[PDB]
Amino acid sequence: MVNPTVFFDIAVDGEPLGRVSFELFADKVPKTAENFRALSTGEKGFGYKGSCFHRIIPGFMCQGGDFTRHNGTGGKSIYGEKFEDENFILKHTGPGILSMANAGPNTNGSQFFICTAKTEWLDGKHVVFGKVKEGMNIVEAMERFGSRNGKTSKKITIADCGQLE
């Protein structure tokens, strides 16, 4: 019944920064939420631990989850390489929204982004499946290492991750 919570412990060139936790809307997008959950625990034998935020645009979003190519071209879901857009019930309402990156319709893998602004233009094209619960301050700190073109000035990693509670 209860939506699951997952955490990322974030590091900046290897130096611990802080924890970000997320509520995953399993009640509204269960297939998508379960993929992110499972990738955060690593229970299928692959996942986010050790991966980076490869693209960070201040005033827009922080993107990550490419654990296979490390640069935005890769990633895979727990269901296979790519799974369908589950639904577009939830909207990109503001900072802290967690949503799937994709390369076209029905191309979800493992890549995700965390909004740091309202990104309404993505509604109905990216599946929203969670939100930051605690540590929006840590997201804002991460965001300061981005740039206009998205290249990061220091390496922003998920040092550890998993499920809370």
Ligand SMILES: CCOC(=O)CNC(=O)N(Cc1ccc(N)cc1)Cc1cn(C)nn1
């Ligand atoms: C705000 C969300 O934007 C996207 O998802 C657009 N596509 C996307 O970002 N990527 C393409 C992508 C997304 C998901 C999958 N599964 C594969 C490719 C990853 C990427 C591209 N670049 C230059 N840096 N990162």
